[PDB]
Amino acid sequence: NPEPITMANARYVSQDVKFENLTNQLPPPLLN
């Protein structure tokens, strides 16, 4: 059941090269 990525389902983690380098349409936890 796709839901918006918010702080309720995301935690901050360190940099990993296997992650995704989002450049546009970022989720709220990755803004400002």
Next chain:
Amino acid sequence: NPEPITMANARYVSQDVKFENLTNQLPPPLLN
């Protein structure tokens, strides 16, 4: 031991119909 609600004891969760809808004297996590 009643203590103020803060990030030390409050964890963000998704919306649910069984939670209290608050309008006055909000905890700091729910402000702004």
